[PDB]
Structures are given as C-alpha cells and as structure tokens.
Short mmCIF file of C-alpha atoms and ligand atoms in Angstrom, two decimals:
data_model
loop_
_atom_site.label_atom_id
_atom_site.label_comp_id
_atom_site.label_asym_id
_atom_site.label_seq_id
_atom_site.Cartn_x
_atom_site.Cartn_y
_atom_site.Cartn_z
CA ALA A 1 -18.12 22.18 -9.17
CA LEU A 2 -14.99 19.71 -10.08
CA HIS A 3 -12.83 18.26 -7.01
CA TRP A 4 -16.43 16.96 -6.14
CA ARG A 5 -17.54 16.00 -9.81
CA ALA A 6 -13.86 15.34 -11.29
CA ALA A 7 -12.85 12.76 -8.22
CA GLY A 8 -16.56 11.05 -8.72
CA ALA A 9 -15.85 10.76 -12.51
CA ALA A 10 -12.03 9.44 -12.15
CA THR A 11 -12.94 6.51 -10.31
CA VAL A 12 -15.06 5.50 -13.42
CA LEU A 13 -11.52 5.89 -15.20
CA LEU A 14 -10.59 3.17 -12.83
CA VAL A 15 -12.88 0.49 -14.20
CA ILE A 16 -11.76 1.18 -17.45
CA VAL A 17 -8.04 0.66 -16.16
CA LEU A 18 -9.50 -2.64 -14.18
CA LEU A 19 -11.57 -4.09 -17.08
CA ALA A 20 -8.93 -3.09 -19.63
CA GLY A 21 -5.90 -4.64 -18.19
CA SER A 22 -7.73 -7.69 -17.25
CA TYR A 23 -8.68 -8.42 -20.76
CA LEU A 24 -5.25 -7.06 -21.80
CA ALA A 25 -2.96 -8.79 -19.53
CA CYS A 26 -4.69 -12.05 -20.03
CA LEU A 27 -3.78 -12.21 -23.89
CA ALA A 28 -0.04 -11.70 -22.89
CA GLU A 29 -0.38 -14.31 -20.33
CA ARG A 30 -2.64 -16.85 -22.31
CA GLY A 31 0.05 -19.35 -23.58
CA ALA A 32 3.37 -19.80 -21.26
CA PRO A 33 4.18 -20.77 -17.60
CA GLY A 34 1.67 -18.07 -16.82
CA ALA A 35 0.31 -18.35 -13.31
CA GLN A 36 -3.72 -18.75 -12.75
CA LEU A 37 -3.83 -15.32 -14.72
CA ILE A 38 -4.22 -17.41 -17.81
CA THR A 39 -7.82 -16.73 -16.95
CA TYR A 40 -9.89 -13.36 -17.67
CA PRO A 41 -11.86 -13.62 -14.23
CA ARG A 42 -8.83 -14.46 -12.89
CA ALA A 43 -7.17 -11.51 -13.88
CA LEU A 44 -10.18 -9.57 -13.05
CA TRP A 45 -9.45 -10.39 -9.66
CA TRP A 46 -5.87 -9.70 -9.92
CA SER A 47 -6.11 -6.00 -11.16
CA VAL A 48 -8.79 -5.36 -8.34
CA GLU A 49 -6.20 -6.67 -5.64
CA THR A 50 -3.49 -4.57 -7.59
CA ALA A 51 -5.66 -1.67 -7.87
CA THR A 52 -5.46 -1.76 -3.91
CA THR A 53 -1.72 -1.99 -4.12
CA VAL A 54 -2.44 -5.20 -1.99
CA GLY A 55 -0.18 -7.67 -3.52
CA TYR A 56 -1.67 -11.09 -2.31
CA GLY A 57 0.98 -13.11 -4.48
CA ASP A 58 -1.45 -15.95 -5.43
CA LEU A 59 -1.18 -14.88 -9.17
CA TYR A 60 0.69 -12.21 -11.07
CA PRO A 61 1.93 -11.86 -14.86
CA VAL A 62 5.13 -13.18 -15.83
CA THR A 63 5.16 -12.37 -19.63
CA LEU A 64 7.15 -9.03 -19.99
CA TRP A 65 4.00 -7.71 -21.53
CA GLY A 66 1.78 -8.68 -18.86
CA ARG A 67 4.43 -7.46 -16.54
CA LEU A 68 4.14 -3.69 -18.01
CA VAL A 69 0.62 -3.56 -18.05
CA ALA A 70 0.41 -4.56 -14.42
CA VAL A 71 2.64 -1.26 -13.56
CA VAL A 72 -0.15 0.51 -15.33
CA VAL A 73 -3.08 -0.98 -13.72
CA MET A 74 -1.48 -0.35 -10.68
CA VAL A 75 -0.81 3.39 -11.12
CA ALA A 76 -4.43 3.73 -12.25
CA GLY A 77 -5.61 2.83 -8.84
CA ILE A 78 -3.09 4.94 -7.09
CA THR A 79 -3.23 8.02 -9.23
CA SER A 80 -6.77 7.26 -9.12
CA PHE A 81 -6.79 7.04 -5.16
CA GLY A 82 -4.90 9.92 -4.27
CA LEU A 83 -7.29 12.03 -5.89
CA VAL A 84 -10.03 10.94 -3.55
CA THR A 85 -7.87 11.87 -0.74
CA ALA A 86 -7.20 15.27 -2.59
CA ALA A 87 -11.13 15.92 -2.81
CA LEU A 88 -10.98 15.09 0.69
CA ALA A 89 -8.79 17.55 1.91
CA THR A 90 -10.56 20.32 -0.28
CA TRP A 91 -13.56 19.39 1.10
CA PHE A 92 -11.97 19.58 4.78
CA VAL A 93 -11.12 23.16 4.39
CA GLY A 94 -14.03 24.24 2.45
CA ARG A 95 -15.83 24.44 5.72
CA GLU A 96 -12.80 25.53 7.53
CA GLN A 97 -13.23 29.18 6.15
CA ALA B 1 4.74 26.55 -11.16
CA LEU B 2 6.08 24.32 -8.53
CA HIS B 3 3.25 22.25 -7.00
CA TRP B 4 2.51 21.07 -10.48
CA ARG B 5 6.11 20.89 -12.11
CA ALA B 6 7.82 19.96 -8.75
CA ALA B 7 5.72 16.71 -8.81
CA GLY B 8 5.95 16.54 -12.52
CA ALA B 9 9.78 16.47 -11.72
CA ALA B 10 10.07 14.36 -8.67
CA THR B 11 8.25 11.31 -10.88
CA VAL B 12 10.62 11.49 -13.61
CA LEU B 13 13.16 11.73 -10.69
CA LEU B 14 12.11 8.48 -8.93
CA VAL B 15 12.36 6.39 -12.15
CA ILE B 16 15.87 6.69 -12.01
CA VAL B 17 15.76 5.78 -8.32
CA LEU B 18 13.98 2.46 -9.07
CA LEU B 19 17.21 1.86 -11.62
CA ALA B 20 19.53 2.78 -8.96
CA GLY B 21 18.42 0.17 -6.20
CA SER B 22 17.94 -2.24 -9.30
CA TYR B 23 21.66 -2.48 -10.10
CA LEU B 24 22.60 -1.88 -6.49
CA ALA B 25 20.19 -4.80 -5.16
CA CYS B 26 21.23 -7.31 -7.34
CA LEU B 27 25.19 -6.85 -7.37
CA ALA B 28 24.42 -7.30 -3.83
CA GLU B 29 22.16 -10.34 -4.12
CA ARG B 30 23.89 -12.12 -7.31
CA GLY B 31 26.12 -14.27 -5.42
CA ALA B 32 24.34 -16.21 -2.70
CA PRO B 33 21.32 -18.43 -1.70
CA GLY B 34 19.51 -15.16 -2.94
CA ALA B 35 16.37 -15.81 -5.24
CA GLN B 36 15.80 -14.68 -8.73
CA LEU B 37 17.14 -11.36 -7.33
CA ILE B 38 20.37 -12.44 -9.52
CA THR B 39 19.27 -11.12 -12.92
CA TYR B 40 19.14 -7.45 -13.89
CA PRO B 41 15.76 -7.74 -15.67
CA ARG B 42 14.02 -9.16 -12.54
CA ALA B 43 15.13 -6.72 -10.04
CA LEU B 44 13.40 -4.26 -12.41
CA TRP B 45 10.07 -5.96 -11.73
CA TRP B 46 11.32 -6.46 -8.15
CA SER B 47 11.90 -2.84 -7.52
CA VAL B 48 8.75 -1.93 -9.42
CA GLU B 49 6.56 -4.13 -7.38
CA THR B 50 8.53 -2.90 -4.32
CA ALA B 51 8.25 0.84 -4.73
CA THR B 52 4.33 0.63 -5.40
CA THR B 53 4.19 -0.90 -1.95
CA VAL B 54 2.35 -4.15 -3.58
CA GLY B 55 4.78 -7.05 -2.29
CA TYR B 56 3.69 -10.27 -4.25
CA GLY B 57 6.39 -11.81 -2.22
CA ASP B 58 7.26 -13.77 -5.83
CA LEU B 59 10.91 -12.22 -5.51
CA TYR B 60 12.34 -10.76 -2.50
CA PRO B 61 15.92 -9.76 -1.79
CA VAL B 62 17.68 -11.60 1.19
CA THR B 63 21.15 -10.18 1.66
CA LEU B 64 21.24 -7.30 4.21
CA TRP B 65 22.67 -4.79 1.85
CA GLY B 66 20.27 -5.72 -1.00
CA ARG B 67 17.84 -5.18 1.75
CA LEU B 68 18.76 -1.61 2.97
CA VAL B 69 18.47 -0.72 -0.93
CA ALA B 70 15.01 -2.08 -0.70
CA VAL B 71 14.15 -0.21 2.53
CA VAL B 72 15.27 2.63 0.27
CA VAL B 73 13.68 1.50 -2.60
CA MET B 74 10.16 1.35 -0.75
CA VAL B 75 10.45 5.03 0.51
CA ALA B 76 10.95 6.16 -2.89
CA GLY B 77 7.92 5.08 -4.18
CA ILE B 78 5.60 6.39 -1.28
CA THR B 79 7.28 10.01 -1.13
CA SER B 80 7.16 10.30 -4.77
CA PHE B 81 3.71 9.35 -4.61
CA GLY B 82 2.52 11.46 -1.57
CA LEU B 83 3.87 14.43 -3.62
CA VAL B 84 1.55 13.92 -6.37
CA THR B 85 -0.98 13.42 -3.89
CA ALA B 86 0.01 16.98 -2.33
CA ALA B 87 -0.15 18.20 -6.16
CA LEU B 88 -3.63 16.87 -6.54
CA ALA B 89 -4.71 18.40 -3.18
CA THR B 90 -3.68 22.22 -3.67
CA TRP B 91 -4.87 22.29 -7.32
CA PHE B 92 -8.40 21.45 -5.59
CA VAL B 93 -7.53 24.28 -3.48
CA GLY B 94 -6.41 26.69 -5.98
CA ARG B 95 -10.28 26.40 -7.21
CA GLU B 96 -11.35 27.96 -3.97
CA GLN B 97 -11.74 31.49 -5.12
CA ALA C 1 7.63 25.59 11.86
CA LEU C 2 4.89 22.66 12.60
CA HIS C 3 3.77 20.69 9.39
CA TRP C 4 7.42 20.78 8.61
CA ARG C 5 8.95 19.72 11.95
CA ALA C 6 6.33 17.69 13.24
CA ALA C 7 6.61 15.48 10.10
CA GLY C 8 10.53 15.86 10.70
CA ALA C 9 10.13 14.54 14.21
CA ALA C 10 7.08 11.96 13.65
CA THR C 11 9.40 9.79 11.55
CA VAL C 12 11.64 9.51 14.44
CA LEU C 13 8.63 7.91 16.33
CA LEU C 14 8.15 5.65 13.32
CA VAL C 15 11.74 4.36 13.45
CA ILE C 16 11.22 3.92 17.07
CA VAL C 17 8.15 2.01 16.69
CA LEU C 18 10.06 -0.62 14.46
CA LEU C 19 12.53 -1.01 16.91
CA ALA C 20 9.83 -1.79 19.55
CA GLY C 21 7.58 -4.15 17.57
CA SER C 22 10.62 -5.91 16.61
CA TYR C 23 12.28 -6.79 19.81
CA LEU C 24 8.35 -7.18 20.87
CA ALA C 25 6.57 -9.25 18.38
CA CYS C 26 9.52 -11.42 18.58
CA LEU C 27 9.25 -12.79 22.09
CA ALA C 28 5.56 -13.29 21.40
CA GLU C 29 6.33 -15.46 18.20
CA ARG C 30 9.73 -17.10 20.06
CA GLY C 31 8.60 -20.57 21.15
CA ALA C 32 5.83 -21.93 18.92
CA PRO C 33 4.94 -23.06 15.52
CA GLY C 34 5.88 -19.56 14.21
CA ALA C 35 7.85 -18.54 11.27
CA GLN C 36 11.26 -17.03 11.05
CA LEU C 37 9.43 -14.45 13.49
CA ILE C 38 11.55 -15.91 16.19
CA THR C 39 14.90 -14.02 15.45
CA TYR C 40 15.57 -10.06 16.28
CA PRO C 41 16.91 -9.04 13.37
CA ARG C 42 14.03 -11.31 11.19
CA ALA C 43 11.31 -8.98 12.25
CA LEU C 44 13.38 -5.86 11.61
CA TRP C 45 12.99 -6.85 7.63
CA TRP C 46 9.42 -7.43 8.12
CA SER C 47 8.91 -4.20 9.97
CA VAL C 48 10.39 -2.08 6.96
CA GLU C 49 8.05 -3.98 4.75
CA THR C 50 5.08 -3.99 7.57
CA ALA C 51 5.36 -0.34 8.05
CA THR C 52 5.40 0.41 4.44
CA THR C 53 2.85 -1.92 4.36
CA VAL C 54 4.25 -3.99 1.52
CA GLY C 55 3.21 -7.67 2.30
CA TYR C 56 5.88 -9.78 0.74
CA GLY C 57 4.45 -12.83 2.96
CA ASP C 58 7.81 -13.96 3.56
CA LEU C 59 7.13 -13.26 6.93
CA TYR C 60 4.29 -12.68 9.41
CA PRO C 61 3.32 -13.36 13.01
CA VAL C 62 0.46 -15.94 13.81
CA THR C 63 0.40 -15.63 17.85
CA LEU C 64 -2.46 -13.54 18.70
CA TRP C 65 -0.07 -11.26 20.52
CA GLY C 66 2.20 -11.56 17.54
CA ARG C 67 -0.47 -10.25 15.22
CA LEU C 68 -1.37 -7.40 17.70
CA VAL C 69 2.09 -5.60 17.46
CA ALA C 70 1.92 -6.06 13.55
CA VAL C 71 -1.40 -3.83 13.56
CA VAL C 72 0.09 -1.64 16.00
CA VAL C 73 3.35 -0.98 13.68
CA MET C 74 1.34 -0.74 10.27
CA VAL C 75 -1.37 1.88 11.67
CA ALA C 76 2.20 3.60 12.58
CA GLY C 77 3.59 3.01 9.19
CA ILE C 78 0.29 4.50 7.01
CA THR C 79 0.09 7.07 9.82
CA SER C 80 4.04 8.42 10.02
CA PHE C 81 3.70 8.94 6.18
CA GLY C 82 0.19 10.46 5.64
CA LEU C 83 2.12 13.28 7.81
CA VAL C 84 4.86 13.74 5.07
CA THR C 85 2.14 13.64 2.63
CA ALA C 86 0.44 16.75 4.74
CA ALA C 87 3.71 18.55 5.15
CA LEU C 88 3.88 18.16 1.41
CA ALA C 89 0.48 19.05 0.77
CA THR C 90 0.76 22.74 2.99
CA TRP C 91 4.28 23.62 1.53
CA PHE C 92 2.62 23.08 -1.97
CA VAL C 93 0.27 26.07 -0.48
CA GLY C 94 2.97 28.33 1.34
CA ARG C 95 3.86 29.36 -1.75
CA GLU C 96 0.26 30.56 -2.92
CA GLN C 97 1.21 34.09 -2.03
CA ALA D 1 -14.80 20.78 14.86
CA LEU D 2 -15.19 18.73 11.61
CA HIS D 3 -12.03 17.80 10.00
CA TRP D 4 -11.01 16.53 13.24
CA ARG D 5 -14.18 14.93 14.75
CA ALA D 6 -15.22 13.64 11.20
CA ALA D 7 -11.96 11.61 10.79
CA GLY D 8 -12.03 10.65 14.55
CA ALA D 9 -15.49 9.19 13.56
CA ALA D 10 -14.63 7.58 10.42
CA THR D 11 -12.03 5.40 12.10
CA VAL D 12 -14.47 3.87 14.69
CA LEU D 13 -16.86 3.46 11.75
CA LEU D 14 -14.13 1.78 9.99
CA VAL D 15 -13.34 -0.64 12.76
CA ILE D 16 -16.83 -1.49 12.77
CA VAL D 17 -16.83 -2.21 8.97
CA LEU D 18 -13.79 -4.58 9.14
CA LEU D 19 -15.86 -6.67 11.49
CA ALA D 20 -18.97 -6.86 9.42
CA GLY D 21 -16.91 -8.39 5.99
CA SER D 22 -15.23 -10.73 8.30
CA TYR D 23 -18.20 -12.68 9.33
CA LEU D 24 -19.79 -11.80 6.15
CA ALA D 25 -16.72 -12.90 4.37
CA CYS D 26 -16.22 -16.49 6.33
CA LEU D 27 -19.64 -17.57 5.60
CA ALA D 28 -19.53 -16.88 1.94
CA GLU D 29 -16.11 -18.94 2.07
CA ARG D 30 -16.70 -21.39 4.84
CA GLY D 31 -17.43 -24.81 2.80
CA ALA D 32 -15.13 -25.24 -0.22
CA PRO D 33 -11.73 -25.42 -1.68
CA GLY D 34 -11.21 -22.27 0.61
CA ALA D 35 -7.97 -21.49 2.38
CA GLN D 36 -8.12 -20.36 5.99
CA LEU D 37 -11.20 -18.28 5.79
CA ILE D 38 -13.43 -20.78 7.46
CA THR D 39 -12.41 -19.66 10.76
CA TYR D 40 -13.91 -16.41 12.21
CA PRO D 41 -10.87 -15.14 14.01
CA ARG D 42 -8.69 -15.85 11.19
CA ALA D 43 -10.76 -13.59 8.85
CA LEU D 44 -10.10 -10.68 11.50
CA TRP D 45 -6.40 -11.04 10.85
CA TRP D 46 -7.15 -11.27 7.16
CA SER D 47 -9.46 -8.07 6.83
CA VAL D 48 -6.83 -6.20 8.86
CA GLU D 49 -3.81 -6.79 6.56
CA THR D 50 -6.20 -6.21 3.91
CA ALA D 51 -8.02 -3.15 4.67
CA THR D 52 -4.60 -1.96 5.27
CA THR D 53 -3.23 -2.88 1.70
CA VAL D 54 -0.40 -5.20 2.76
CA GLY D 55 -1.32 -8.20 1.25
CA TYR D 56 1.07 -10.93 2.76
CA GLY D 57 -0.53 -13.78 0.87
CA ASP D 58 -0.64 -16.21 3.47
CA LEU D 59 -4.57 -16.19 2.97
CA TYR D 60 -6.94 -15.04 0.50
CA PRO D 61 -10.34 -15.96 -0.23
CA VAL D 62 -11.60 -17.09 -3.73
CA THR D 63 -15.40 -17.69 -3.43
CA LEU D 64 -16.58 -14.86 -5.78
CA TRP D 65 -19.02 -13.41 -3.07
CA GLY D 66 -15.95 -13.37 -0.25
CA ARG D 67 -14.12 -11.85 -3.00
CA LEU D 68 -16.56 -9.19 -4.01
CA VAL D 69 -16.71 -8.33 -0.29
CA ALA D 70 -12.98 -8.04 0.05
CA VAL D 71 -13.05 -5.37 -2.61
CA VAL D 72 -15.49 -3.59 -0.47
CA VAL D 73 -12.89 -3.94 2.69
CA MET D 74 -9.93 -2.58 0.82
CA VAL D 75 -11.65 0.53 -0.07
CA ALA D 76 -12.41 1.11 3.90
CA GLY D 77 -9.27 1.10 4.62
CA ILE D 78 -7.89 3.41 2.01
CA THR D 79 -10.91 5.63 2.36
CA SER D 80 -10.88 5.54 5.85
CA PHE D 81 -7.27 6.56 5.87
CA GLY D 82 -7.27 9.47 3.01
CA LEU D 83 -9.32 10.99 5.69
CA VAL D 84 -6.51 11.24 8.13
CA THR D 85 -4.45 12.54 5.65
CA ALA D 86 -6.86 15.45 4.90
CA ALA D 87 -7.34 16.10 8.43
CA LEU D 88 -3.66 16.26 9.00
CA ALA D 89 -3.05 18.29 6.31
CA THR D 90 -5.74 20.89 7.08
CA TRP D 91 -4.60 20.90 10.98
CA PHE D 92 -1.06 21.52 9.73
CA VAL D 93 -1.99 24.13 7.45
CA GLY D 94 -4.49 26.19 9.66
CA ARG D 95 -1.65 27.14 11.51
CA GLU D 96 -0.24 29.68 8.90
CA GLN D 97 -2.24 32.48 10.32
C1 LIG E 1 -4.37 2.72 3.63
C2 LIG E 1 -2.98 2.11 3.58
C3 LIG E 1 -2.51 3.09 2.52
C4 LIG E 1 -1.47 2.07 1.29
N1 LIG E 1 -0.90 3.39 0.50
C5 LIG E 1 -1.89 3.82 -0.23
C6 LIG E 1 -3.21 3.18 -0.75
C7 LIG E 1 -3.38 3.14 -2.30
C8 LIG E 1 -4.28 2.36 -2.63
C9 LIG E 1 -0.34 2.36 -0.40
C10 LIG E 1 0.79 3.41 -1.11
C11 LIG E 1 0.70 3.45 -2.67
C12 LIG E 1 1.17 4.60 -3.18
C13 LIG E 1 -0.28 4.21 1.25
C14 LIG E 1 1.07 3.26 1.97
C15 LIG E 1 1.09 3.76 3.38
C16 LIG E 1 2.81 3.66 3.63
S1 LIG E 2 22.96 -6.77 -10.89
C1 LIG E 2 24.54 -7.50 -11.07
C2 LIG E 2 24.71 -7.98 -12.70
C3 LIG E 2 25.62 -8.29 -13.30
C4 LIG E 2 25.50 -8.40 -14.67
C5 LIG E 2 25.96 -9.47 -15.31
C6 LIG E 2 26.32 -6.99 -15.25
N1 LIG E 2 24.11 -7.88 -14.74
O1 LIG E 2 23.70 -8.09 -15.78
C7 LIG E 2 23.73 -7.63 -13.42
C8 LIG E 2 22.74 -6.19 -13.39
C9 LIG E 2 22.62 -8.82 -13.27
S1 LIG E 3 -17.46 -17.30 10.00
C1 LIG E 3 -18.78 -18.72 10.10
C2 LIG E 3 -18.69 -18.88 11.47
C3 LIG E 3 -19.49 -19.83 12.05
C4 LIG E 3 -19.37 -19.63 13.42
C5 LIG E 3 -19.50 -21.11 14.06
C6 LIG E 3 -20.47 -19.02 14.20
N1 LIG E 3 -18.16 -18.86 13.83
O1 LIG E 3 -17.42 -18.67 14.73
C7 LIG E 3 -17.51 -18.64 12.57
C8 LIG E 3 -17.29 -17.03 12.58
C9 LIG E 3 -16.24 -19.06 12.34
K1 LIG E 4 0.40 -1.32 0.00
K1 LIG E 5 0.94 -3.69 -0.45
#
C-alpha cells in the first residue's frame, strides 16, 4: 500500500534530516561563541532532541546559519511525525468499515 | 481542493503571524529588565523556537504583554501544524477506494 | 455538531485546568526551596508554556505534589489539542462529498 | 471496539515504558559527570516531561547510553499520543452517518 509504506519510508527521511543538519549546523557553529555545538556528536544529539521538539536548552545554534538549519531539522521531525499520526488514523478507520 | 490547499495556505498564513508577535513582543519587552527580547532579529528566533513548541529557554519574554503575545504565538504554531496533520490524515483516507 | 463543538467546548475545559493547576501547584510549591512557583500569576505563565508543552525551563515544580499537578496539566495540553487536530481531520473529510 | 480499546491499551503500555527507561536510564547515568540522573525518582520526573515533548532543561543525561535511551523515550510519548489523536478523529467522524 502507501499510508503504510510511505510513512515507513519518510522516517528514513528523518535520519537524513538528522545526520545532515548535524554535520551541517556544526560547520556553521565551529568557530564562534557557539555553545557545545562546535562538536559533531554534540550536534547529532541536539537534532535528536530537537527532532522530538523537546528543547532542553543545554545547547543551541547561535550562528545565523546554524539557527536556520535548526528550523529545518525541527520541521523535519514534525512533518515526519504528523505522518505516523496520519497513517495511524487511516489504519484505525480501515477496520472501522 | 481544500484539505490540501487550505493547509498549503494556513502555513503561508502562520509565517506572517510569527512576524506579528515578533514586532509585537519586542516593543512590549524592549524597555525593561527583559532579556535579549529587545532586538528585533532575536525575537524572530524566539517566535520561531516558541511556535515549534521547543522552548530552549535561551530567550523568553518577561513583560505581561510580550507574554500574551507569546501565548498567541504558540497557539499559532500548534493549530497551523494540526492542519497539516489533518491534511495528511485525509489524503491517506483518499486512498481507501 | 460534535467533532466541531466538542472541540469548541473542550478548550474551555483546558482553560479551566490552567486556572486549576495554577492556583493548585502554587500552594504545593509555596513554602520550600521551590522556584518562583510560589506566586499565583507566576504559575499561570508556566501553564501556557506547560499546557502547550513548551518547556522554557525558566519555571518548574520540584515538590512531589507540585510535580503531580504539572503532569496532570500537560496531559490536558496535548489532549485538549489532539481534539482540535481531529476536529480538523474530519472537517477535511466532510467535503469528500 | 478497536480504535477505542487499542488506544486505551497503548496508554497503559506507555506508562509502563517510561518506568523501564527510568531505571534503565539512571544506571547508565549514575556514576559520572551526570546531572541529577543518579536518583531513581528524579528520572521519573525526567522521562515524564521528556516523553511529553516539553524539555524544560533542568536536567538532561549525557551518557551515550542514557541518551540513546532517551530518544527511545520521547518516541514513546509522541507515538502513544498520535494514537489518541487517530482514535479521537475516528470517533468524531463515525458520527456522520
Ligand atoms: C506528545 C506531545 C505532543 C508534542 N507535539 C507534537 C510532537 C511532535 C514531536 C508538539 C507539537 C509540534 C508541532 C504536540 C504539541 C502538543 C500541544
Ligand atoms: S521590537 C521593537 C524594535 C524597535 C526597533 C528599534 C524599530 N527595532 O528594530 C525593534 C523591532 C527591535
Ligand atoms: S537508578 C539506580 C538506582 C539504584 C537504586 C539504589 C536501586 N535506586 O533506587 C536507584 C533507582 C536510584
Ligand atoms: K513540545
Ligand atoms: K517542547
């Protein structure tokens, strides 16, 4: 099908928005007052939290560019998440017939 | 359509909303013990991180007014998002035929 | 209707819960090494951010009771809102005709 | 039913989940530069704000493992919730008849 195969495949987009932005923000925040982001595994952690729209605060991109990227990496894991929730609704109705 | 173009539109809608709170927040907070909520280009990243419902904490309006606005600015990001979810939802439904 | 007036009514309940936990958590966090969670108008601002599950971190309860109210409110946030997402979901179907 | 019992059921299962990661977490991050993740009862309040998607910032583990775990924990919260959303949407839709 789709709603079942598509949702399963767009999470695999999520890794992309996570691994990408990590190794992207981090070379925008490499040289500067940038928080503990100047690190790649640091960033990888950030995006992870960010992905879940958590927002601990422990870290965050300060660089104008790192900042934008963020915006991207969070949309990623909400856009990505609303999908699961949408497959979920269609699946619940599939048997409601 | 609607459930597809009405969400296309509410997204484009919200963006302006973010800008609103931004220069509404920040005239509210730009004259007091307020935090970085004084400069325009900050509130931007503020309204952004606020809408997505992350809440690092790095910045956070103090004034009562800057505060309502926020309350407004959050709801925007949630409602705006809940649409895209509903849009996704039915578009999965529209493959039940 | 329902999905359209049960949501329009359940926000009222969510609004009530804020006003509830606010003047509730506050006497739980009154006396004792607790953040500004002592004032009445202080918690109110935390509810808005709590209900929507923002998590600035600027304010939060630490007393086993103070904490209980929190969890009770946030579940109200996330709840009161999944409704308006599901009001929106079905309204996007009611024009499948 | 299903969409009503399945979600009733995933909530109870989710509640049990948080506990798992909590004593699973607190053991990963109980003996190092770790914050307040050493105490069992703390982690409870950690997972709980965590699985909700809040992210106050007052605490946060950093042990690679306690961390990986967390990523597991958020997913629980959102997933668990996305259910309640699909069920609410279907229950509100099954009233069109
Ligand atoms: C399970 C808590 C729900 C958290 N949400 C969605 C999680 C997405 C990772 C955050 C809104 C992000 C648009 C919904 C806000 C609840 C008011
Ligand atoms: S938000 C208040 C404000 C005044 C002015 C000097 C015009 N700005 O640039 C901002 C938007 C900060
Ligand atoms: S979480 C590690 C831990 C060990 C023990 C003493 C059994 N605990 O009560 C906790 C959970 C704190
Ligand atoms: K959130
Ligand atoms: K959050």
